[PDB]
Amino acid sequence: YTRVVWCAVGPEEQKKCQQWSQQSGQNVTCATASTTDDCIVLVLKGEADALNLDGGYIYTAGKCGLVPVLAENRKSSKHSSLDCVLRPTEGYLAVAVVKKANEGLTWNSLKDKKSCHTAVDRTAGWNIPMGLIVNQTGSCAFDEFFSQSCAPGADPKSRLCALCAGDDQGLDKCVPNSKEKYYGYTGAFRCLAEDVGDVAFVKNDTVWENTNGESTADWAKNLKREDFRLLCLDGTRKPVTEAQSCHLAVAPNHAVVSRSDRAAHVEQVLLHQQALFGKNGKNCPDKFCLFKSETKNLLFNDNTECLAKLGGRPTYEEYLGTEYVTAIANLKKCSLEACAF
């Protein structure tokens, strides 16, 4: 066997990867980059093998020839008896979240408010909400819609980064990695929870995992679900229990990608790695758990039950679905058939 070189995005992922490398006995090793885009370039050069990507990034990687290998699979209810690895993925719900106390803020009065985004180019944090906003406003000036934002990956001197905080020292403001205080699902929800923004564009799971004591993190300790509302497209506000009827879209699960010529090798290694360090793995929680990182979703989402085989050997377009692909295509017209690298 050859080793698999995993690509870690930023210093916190690098630390988790190093631990996994040690525990795997160097069956997995680590390369590190500052952004997801740079990790994708590493994979293309053949300097790294794989990383787990949000749907929006799978689109970028796909244009450049990378293929989906295995998908994150979280808890379900349907397909009960079927093993996690073979169970179809269900997809997550992209939602827009506000404080209950911010009364009369609805989908239709979002203009000139403050926004919290997981990162530019990501499914729930960006592509879905901004795609809808462009369509509804007939304008590609989505950078003038919100008064101020935190959208990791945008220009640090623009309004889109105005609310981003950087790291401990206030360095790396708006970098699309976990060094940025408000990056990712948990970061964007924190941006709302601390009332830096009026709205966060996250997924349904984020609200549940960071309220009612599900998170012992300082800022999330006292957060109650009832203090939050979801914004529906029909102009209403619902309790966070109603996400099935009040979401902006269903997103395809985050998935491991690699170069096509390395796909089968990456697959084999990962299946074995999860038997050891996965949810009921030999060595988890005794030595190391691949799918834990204390609420920080490092390398993988913390709610990941397993990585699932795909079936139908999907291309990246099949994986993302024709609905989502055309949504992205239409939005990319603002800022068509190539590879950004």
Ligand SMILES: *[C@@H]1O[C@H](CO)[C@@H](O[C@@H]2O[C@H](CO)[C@@H](O[C@@H]3O[C@H](CO)[C@@H](O[C@@H]4O[C@H](CO)[C@@H](O[C@@H]5O[C@H](CO)[C@@H](O[C@@H]6O[C@H](CO)[C@@H](O)[C@H](O)[C@@H]6O)[C@H](O)[C@@H]5O)[C@H](O)[C@@H]4O)[C@H](O)[C@@H]3O)[C@H](O)[C@H]2NC(C)=O)[C@H](O)[C@H]1NC(C)=O
């Ligand atoms: C937005 O995000 C949230 C966070 O991701 C989502 O909430 C999460 O939902 C999942 C399920 O989708 C939860 O997992 C469950 O958590 C339970 C409690 O911790 C766990 O323990 C039990 O598991 C049992 C087995 O499932 C459950 O017993 C039954 O299970 C079966 C189906 O498997 C059913 O059987 C029925 O029982 C009926 C009894 O009245 C009977 O009348 C019927 O005839 C039938 O026999 C039944 O459904 C029943 O539940 C038991 O209920 C417990 O759940 C378990 O592991 C389970 O998987 C997460 O815990 C939730 N996360 C959090 C933090 O709350 C939310 O779903 C999502 N929203 C949307 C719309 O997607």
Ligand SMILES: *[C@@H]1O[C@H](CO)[C@@H](O[C@@H]2O[C@H](CO)[C@@H](O[C@H]3O[C@H](CO[C@@H]4O[C@H](CO)[C@@H](O)[C@H](O)[C@@H]4O)[C@@H](O[C@@H]4O[C@H](CO)[C@@H](O)[C@H](O)[C@@H]4O)[C@H](O)[C@@H]3O)[C@H](O)[C@H]2NC(C)=O)[C@H](O)[C@H]1NC(C)=O
């Ligand atoms: C922003 O605005 C953009 C412009 O309006 C939006 O893009 C448009 O999005 C539409 C929906 O994704 C595209 O239509 C495509 O899907 C159609 C429906 O597919 C079929 O639907 C029927 C009924 O539900 C099913 O029975 C069937 O199985 C298909 O799923 C397509 O119509 C059909 O396509 C099939 C292809 O196999 C064809 O055989 C049929 O004859 C029939 O024509 C259609 O072809 C499209 O693929 C629009 O094309 C698209 N517009 C543009 C400019 O591309 C965008 O979504 C908006 N953004 C957001 C975030 O919402």
Ligand SMILES: *[C@@H]1O[C@H](CO)[C@@H](O[C@@H]2O[C@H](CO)[C@@H](O)[C@H](O)[C@H]2NC(C)=O)[C@H](O)[C@H]1NC(C)=O
């Ligand atoms: C590192 O990879 C190797 C190869 O998969 C593993 O070593 C053994 O592989 C052989 C042949 O495939 C199997 O018969 C054994 O099951 C493996 N050894 C054991 C004891 O399980 C090895 O498991 C990997 N090491 C770690 C820690 O991930």
Ligand SMILES: O[C@H]1[C@H](O)[C@@H](O)[C@H](O)[C@@H](O)[C@H]1O
């Ligand atoms: O596909 C994406 C997208 O086009 C972004 O606008 C660009 O900043 C990224 O580098 C690219 O990978």
Ligand SMILES: O[C@H]1[C@H](O)[C@@H](O)[C@H](O)[C@@H](O)[C@H]1O
């Ligand atoms: O249309 C289907 C669907 O998108 C599945 O998720 C994928 O696994 C299949 O390969 C594809 O044919």
Ligand SMILES: [Fe+3]
């Ligand atoms: Fe996502």
Ligand SMILES: [Zn+2]
């Ligand atoms: Zn829906």
Ligand SMILES: [Zn+2]
């Ligand atoms: Zn196919």
